[PDB]
Design a protein around this ligand. Structure first.
Ligand code: ATP
Ligand code: GDP
Lengths: 636, 242
């Protein structure tokens, strides 16, 4: 059995986080007469030898996150899903701090939906305890994660009030049970536990200035012991030690550091936050947020060979909060496309992640870089008054939510940017904060993120742009026009949401249903292959092969695939002809004589030593182009 | 306007009215939120007095701009080193270039003007950033203007340097005044920046405009190492009618 959990501590610039933990672990000394605010996240671990009938000596490692609002850009890296999050009121500011703690509870919900939460009122010594009302009224069961308890400890001395909290941490840990699993007591191969013991035993034998380990040194540690793990086991083994917080390691291929194995996590988590505090009270020769490489043995080079790898390099945080007044060229209510993203709170590492996903995309309209001006919560990268994109963030009136307005010119060069930013902003939402876009069937389908779209029948002077949920409007694909209860005038959906309709991709691949003659239902036209899915049809009087998609592939992925298929264009690669909705189909060329495997299976006499060559020449011509565009076929 | 003490008081009531409600707008911009037809007369005078968007109290913190082509050879630069920004300089300057949408002539460029800059750009091939930075070890106040060296950019420089000079001699005529007593410091030294190395020059050498204008006998500038030379069209395309 593997008894090791993560106990995340969570607060905001003034709480019993680092002074409540010292009493939870019963650190008897706390020799520092006066300690200071946290930098980084201070990873520590305390064992819990429950002197009882059960000899399970679980050891859960605490991560007392820093509360100051300048480190928030890095926390979502370390808010995993196998953890029991805490939360601290500071009841001294009663009924006003519980409000200031909703963002933390929300990010806990965004990152790790299926994890418990234990609110811990840290102040009793100093006074107001009716805050248990609001926590039961507004904070209990409304979009926020599953709060499993709430206590009011003193947080400076051991007491009966605190002892019963230490007991709840135990009983809530030993009953984690995500998808009926009881995480804290699962079975794992002893090959891992022994690998855990050597890394901890190696943490004492590494250069403190750089505790990092390379895979070369690692593959020798197993040789010193008798570990039965092979090169095919470590990539899984050293990951299971990552989720348990024993060492940090990142398997991303883009971030070329996968040889670096971060033992002693409390160190890397501290270094990444030294840059976010180094100020200069000299000369503001630069605007706020930008900084050049101003600082040991080759480490400084390794330093932002990791910060840049960690995206924190230009510091996308602490960057000109005040926004600059932009005056867009064409703003007459009919040339702009807008799409809000109403969500209750901006997740922790949202903007520093977003403005660093669109930033590195200079090859829009494809390598002509646009001169951009990105404050903390916007980008506004513009090529010309006929093609721009302002991913802003404003607060509406009488609304406590947080919106993400994106305005783009409705021309052709603008329909691309919208359909290309909405992708990145969604490829980020489901990759990082997957519990935002999560259908909470309990209660009602609020979905916590309502991506509105804005439309107006009056081209100009409409006095307002009427909201229209995307989920409801996407279901209006049976036709192509939207129109009010006064059905005289109507708006083409292309104009208000040119991404649901495949209008952003190259214009030559619009389905143009007027000519496609296609009978889905019958199978005698489904002749392609055997009992498959791609049918046969006619498109512009010629024979083609349409590929009906089942319910699996969501539209967000179909749009994600067509963008790479649309620019291959080789005489030795099946080329697209159209793609549309009603239903989600994909049109391509009809290979008249069918695939090759069917040929040499029953028509082995057709290959004639000069068709055996032209086939091999046309396939080596395709690979001559795929490997030129830096893409490997992986299955031939 | 009889009773001057009144008009001089009204023009300053707008610069103090704040709102401790909701910052639904960025700092500096404001809409007509307030008697008998006077309110209409009000900013029929404020706009006449140029104070309307309030070009003052406007986002002092500047936003980090990342220009498209900045390789030391595609940009034209011209400092305006002066000891102190005159009182009503920026609110006057950014309101002289603002109202000029018909550049490249009526296609308005989407601009982002903080307190001491404009940066109105049409495309990565034609823009104009009338900024204001402070150099190192220098107590003066500079006015850097960077423009792409292409054809559509040679116009903007020669068209902004005009407005910024038609303002300097109209409003603050004692700045550009030759003080023959002592020496001709002139209180405003409009430098120009040039570099022989197109890129990686590690610095752009200052060159006073007064001294360089006198180098019209020929058309090329060149250092004491006369192998390589720069056409003046590139560094100051306004002195040459380019
Ligand atoms: N463009 C085309 N023209 C003619 N035939 C095609 C074309 N594309 C595919 N086929 C035939 O379609 C059959 C199935 O197509 P598909 O790409 O779905 O293959 P699959 O993935 O093996 O099938 P499925 O996904 O339906 O299990 C193949 O046997 C192939 O012979
Ligand atoms: N009197 C009192 N002081 C506290 C209590 N909890 C924390 N403090 C003080 O507040 C500080 C706590 O550090 P902390 O806020 O946890 O650091 P951070 O949360 O990591 O920024 C220390 O100075 C403590 O002395 C409490 O319950 N009572």
């Amino acid at each position: 059995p593997y008894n090791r959990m993560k106990l995340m501590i969570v607060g905001n610039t003034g709480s019993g986080k680092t002074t409540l933990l010292q009493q939870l672990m019963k650190t008897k000394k706390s020799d520092l007469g006066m300690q200071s605010a946290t930098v980084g996240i201070d990873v520590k671990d305390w064992p819990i030898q429950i002197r009882d009938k059960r000899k399970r000596d679980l050891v859960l490692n605490v991560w007392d996150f820093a509360g100051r609002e300048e480190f928030y850009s890095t926390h979502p890296h370390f808010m995993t899903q196998r953890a029991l999050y805490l939360a601290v009121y500071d009841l001294s500011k009663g009924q006003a701090e519980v409000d200031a703690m909703k963002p933390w509870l929300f990010n806990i919900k965004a990152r790790a939906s299926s994890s418990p939460v234990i609110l811990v009122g840290t102040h009793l010594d100093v006074s107001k305890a009716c805050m248990s009302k609001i926590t039961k009224e507004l904070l209990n069961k409304r979009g926020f994660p599953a709060i499993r308890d709430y206590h009011f400890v003193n947080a400076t001395e051991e007491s009966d009030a605190l002892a019963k909290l230490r007991k709840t941490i135990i009983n809530e840990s030993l009953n984690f049970k995500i998808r009926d699993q009881l995480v804290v007591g699962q079975l794992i191969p002893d090959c891992y536990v022994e690998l855990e013991k050597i890394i901890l035993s190696e943490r004492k034998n590494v250069p403190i200035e750089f505790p990092v380990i390379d895979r070369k040194r690692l593959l020798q540690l197993v040789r010193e012991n008798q570990l039965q793990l092979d090169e095919n086991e470590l990539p899984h083994a050293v990951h299971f030690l990552n989720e348990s917080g024993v060492l940090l390691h990142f398997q991303d291929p883009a971030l070329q550091l996968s040889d670096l194995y971060f033992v002693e996590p409390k160190w890397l988590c501290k270094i990444m936050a030294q840059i976010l505090t180094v100020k200069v009270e000299g000369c503001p020769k630069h605007p706020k947020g930008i900084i050049s490489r101003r600082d040991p043995k080759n480490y400084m080079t390794q330093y932002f060979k990791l910060l840049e790898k960690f995206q924190i390099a230009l510091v996308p945080s602490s960057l000109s909060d005040h926004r600059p007044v932009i005056e867009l060229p064409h703003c007459e209510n009919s040339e702009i496309i807008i799409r809000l993203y109403e969500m209750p709170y901006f997740p922790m590492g949202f903007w520093s992640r977003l403005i660093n996903r669109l930033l590195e995309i200079s090859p829009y309209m494809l390598a002509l870089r646009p001169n951009r001006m990105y404050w903390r919560q916007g980008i506004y990268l513009n090529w010309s008054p006929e093609a721009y994109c302002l991913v802003g963030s404003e607060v509406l009136d009488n609304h406590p939510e947080s919106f993400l307005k994106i305005t783009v010119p409705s021309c052709r060069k603008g329909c691309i940017l919208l359909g290309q930013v909405v992708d990145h902003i969604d490829s980020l939402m489901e990759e990082w904060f997957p519990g935002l876009l999560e259908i909470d069937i309990c209660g009602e389908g609020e979905t916590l993120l309502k991506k509105w779209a804005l439309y107006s029948f009056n081209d100009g002077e409409e006095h307002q742009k009427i909201l229209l949920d995307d989920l409801m409007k996407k279901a209006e694909e049976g036709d192509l026009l939207v129109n009010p209860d006064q059905p005289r005038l109507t708006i083409p959906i292309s104009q208000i949401a040119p991404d649901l309709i495949l209008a952003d991709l190259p214009r030559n691949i619009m389905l143009n249903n007027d000519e496609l003659e296609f009978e889905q239902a019958p199978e005698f036209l489904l002749g392609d292959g055997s009992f498959g899915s791609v049918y046969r049809a006619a498109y512009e009087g010629e024979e083609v092969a349409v590929k009906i998609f089942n319910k699996h592939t969501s539209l967000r992925l179909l749009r994600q695939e067509l963008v790479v298929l649309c620019h291959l264009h080789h005489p030795s690669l099946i080329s697209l002809l159209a793609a549309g909705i009603r239903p989600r189909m994909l049109v391509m060329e009809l290979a008249s004589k069918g695939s090759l495997d069917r040929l040499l299976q029953q028509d082995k006499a057709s290959l004639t030593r000069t068709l055996q060559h032209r086939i091999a020449l046309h396939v080596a011509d395709g690979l001559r182009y795929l490997h030129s565009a830096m893409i490997i076929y992986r299955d031939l």
